[PDB]
């Protein structure tokens, strides 16, 4: 039949073709010989630091393409506007070895990039994104008010809205703006005597750096990291996030009483900032996102994972149930009392968040409406599926294609 | 090339070295990953009318024998060289071969020992292997199967096991099991396009009765099995009910799970796949081991196109089934799942959970390291289908890749 990949859906039996991957124009890991599907951060889409100013060749080949899409997306492919903007790239890349993007153009490059986002399942949301254009910003003391607008927007007492900050982009053999922190709230994690870690784990090496630049570290499991920014060819500077700003919410179970003791919580906004941005070979090294949570990554990564706070167990005891053997499924019974306690504290709290089992939902909503309008949808079948609970949703029995589709958001990294 | 693999849990990496030894294309390439697709889209196993290509085929056996003197020692001994004298004398004059029983042993376990989705591989090297190459009808198909299922219930006490019929032979039809397991129940397409009993098995089942089966109208009837000799029509051949043995589902806590009158079969006997030693092929050659508690409670018995049983479980448990937040799938299928290993355990039928499993398969993982320098893994069939973060497995990265002996999949003999 179609030489394109043939996609099925075995809950309905349904069949769709993916004619979209003809499209990308980057490898991915996998070769006929083996998958690497598997893999968190394969070396390939890795934005390793390239000082040198890219080859104009390939640089301008790339904004052609982002050009031609910008132009095909409002429906002036082929017109004088789009012919003259091409030569506009191409000689601006002439004379300066770059080139720029009109506000327009880095609105649909962000939404795209988010849209060809193969591991987010929220991408029904897509089309509605608040883009911040903060390409003016000259100084790490104005990348903080920008965050710092985009969290009060963001964050809308609760009725979160989706968002993106954008800071300048790199330049030729200049220093990168940079945000050193993986997301702008994060909970500090200290190394102990013992060699435990009280907080969470995940920020043990972000938290000594804000020591090692005169953070005064407290003591607790949920204290707020500072921000460590970064402008060009400058130490990073730090900067204390104002309370009143960062919505967090204390947990509670609707019916376990004693759920509430356990002082656990978690704050209202996913916003990660350490990724890269890449729109027609352009990269934005600094451009902090953010939607709204899926129950699961508190409730069952950040909470349960044996690597972060890891309290299956406490809960367990708390519950009453036999740690001491597997086929109790006690392990299981708490993961669900604890993803429940999250929908319900948030849901409690007026703080905007969605269930597994909605996400998903909406997620294969996504797929038809992707299928219609580009023929297929880049998606990794291991992150789209939730972590409890996998084949009782609906992705779970839908084969997905993957591959890398540009603009994109891009591991880097780390500054330090 | 040789892909660092790292276990994010707790920061260990190893390295892949294993892979280089593929010499079968996967469904992948680096302009898209197809690693999500159940089924192949060429990768198939196409007709067998004409020999396969000699110098194709002698490459392949030369490899296997080549595996099996290594793997007793032996490599370079006079025997090596001259049973790959053997084999070479065979395919040159007949254009195939066949195997030594003590080949066909160790390539059943390495096939089972290679299969990427398989997360119980650390029983590898248990497997009773019942030689039926000496079959030449579909009565003796029958009688063989009842051995198996006899040996390999063991009252409860399940024994890995696999029967190994005729291998596959140019221009002349293969010999088939219809049913894509020896326990099977049935499933009725009646008035409305529902379905009563198993909605996975409606095929099987008209079959069943177009070739003579006179059906029955339960929820979990036991179908019979269509042997197939070569270019033979398939024969009906109902299993003795004693042979079966099944397990009634109960609750530890709740009273009213017995009511909803649901059950499973002790033995997980696959029977449509094919197996592939040295080149020759194998398409009927059903395999047994035992259970994983999720394929029952979860799979079978939770997924929408099964029994979908979880909204009936949800109002018996009087859950709020008005929206998804309360998470009353999340909670029945836990519920479900405690069942199907309380009542196997009570019954005193081998079965293992979720949690003992992967653990076992990372203690597998780091035992294949050492021996072969990797392990081919398929990490969205070695997650089980809930709690998936919740086990080791589901750190840990992996790398997939076919490595040869191994069970592929084959076309419906229809
Ligand atoms: C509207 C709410 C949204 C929800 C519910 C959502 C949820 C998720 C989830 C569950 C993941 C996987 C997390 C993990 O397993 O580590 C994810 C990944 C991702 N999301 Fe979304 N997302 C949303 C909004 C956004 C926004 C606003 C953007 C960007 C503009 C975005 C970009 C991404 C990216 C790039 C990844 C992949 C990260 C990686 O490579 O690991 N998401 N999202
Ligand atoms: C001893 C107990 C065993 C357990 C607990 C076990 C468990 C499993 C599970 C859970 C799967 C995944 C099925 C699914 O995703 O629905 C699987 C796949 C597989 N197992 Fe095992 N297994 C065992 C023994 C065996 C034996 C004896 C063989 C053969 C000699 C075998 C061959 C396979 C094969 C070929 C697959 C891959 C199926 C495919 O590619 O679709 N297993 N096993
Ligand atoms: N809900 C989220 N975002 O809005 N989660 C989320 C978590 C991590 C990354 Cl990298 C990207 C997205
Ligand atoms: N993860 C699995 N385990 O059985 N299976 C599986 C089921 C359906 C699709 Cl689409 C992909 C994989
Ligand atoms: N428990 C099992 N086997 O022993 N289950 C099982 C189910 C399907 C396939 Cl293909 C292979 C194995
Ligand atoms: N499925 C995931 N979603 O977050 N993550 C994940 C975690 C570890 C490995 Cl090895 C592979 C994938
Ligand atoms: C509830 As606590 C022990
Ligand atoms: C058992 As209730 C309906
Ligand atoms: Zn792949």
């Not at 030729?172 to 102990?192: E, H």
């Not at 990660?272 to 699961?296: D, R």
């Not at 909605?358 to 998606?379: I, W, Y």
């Amino acid at each position: 039949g179609p030489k394109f990949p043939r996609v099925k859906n075995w809950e309905l039996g349904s069949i769709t073709y993916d004619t979209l991957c003809a499209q990308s124009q980057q490898d991915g890991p996998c070769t006929p010989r083996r998958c690497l599907g598997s893999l968190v951060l394969p070396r390939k889409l890795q934005t390793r630091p390239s000082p040198g100013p890219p080859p104009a060749e390939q640089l301008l080949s790339q904004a052609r393409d982002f050009i031609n899409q910008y132009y095909s997306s409002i429906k002036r492919s082929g017109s004088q506007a789009h012919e003259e903007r091409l030569q506009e790239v191409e000689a601006e890349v002439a004379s300066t070895g770059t080139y720029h993007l009109r506000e327009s153009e880095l609105v649909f490059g962000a939404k795209q990039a988010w849209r060809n986002a193969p591991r987010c399942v929220g991408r029904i949301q897509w089309g509605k994104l608040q883009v911040f254009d903060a390409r003016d910003c000259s100084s790490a003391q104005e990348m903080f008010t920008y965050i710092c607008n985009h969290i009060k927007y963001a964050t809308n007492r609760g009725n979160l809205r989706s968002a993106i900050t954008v800071f300048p982009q790199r330049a030729p053999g200049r220093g990168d703006f940079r945000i050193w922190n993986s997301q702008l709230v994060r909970y500090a994690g200290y190394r102990q005597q013992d060699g435990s870690v009280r907080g969470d784990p995940a920020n043990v090496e972000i938290t000594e750096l804000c020591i090692q630049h005169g953070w005064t570290p407290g003591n607790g499991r949920f204290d707020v990291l500072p921000l460590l920014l970064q402008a060009p060819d400058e130490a990073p500077e730090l900067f204390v996030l104002p309370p009143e700003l960062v919505l967090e919410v204390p947990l509670e179970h609707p019916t376990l009483e004693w759920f509430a003791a356990l002082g656990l919580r978690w704050y209202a906004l996913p916003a990660v900032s350490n990724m890269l941005l890449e729109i027609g070979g352009l990269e934005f090294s600094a451009a902090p996102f953010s939607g709204w949570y899926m129950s699961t990554e508190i409730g069952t990564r950040n909470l349960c994972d044996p690597h972060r706070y890891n309290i299956l167990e406490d809960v367990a005891v708390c519950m009453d149930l036999d740690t001491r053997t597997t086929s109790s499924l006690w392990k299981d019974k708490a993961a669900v009392e604890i993803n429940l306690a999250v929908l319900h504290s948030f849901q409690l709290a007026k703080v905007t968040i969605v269930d597994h089992h909605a996400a998903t939902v909406s997620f294969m909503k996504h797929l038809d409406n992707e299928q219609k309008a580009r023929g297929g949808c880049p998606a990794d079948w291991a992150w789209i599926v939730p972590p409890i609970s996998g084949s009782l949703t609906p992705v779970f029995h839908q084969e997905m294609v993957n591959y890398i589709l540009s603009p994109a958001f891009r591991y880097q990294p780390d500054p330090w």
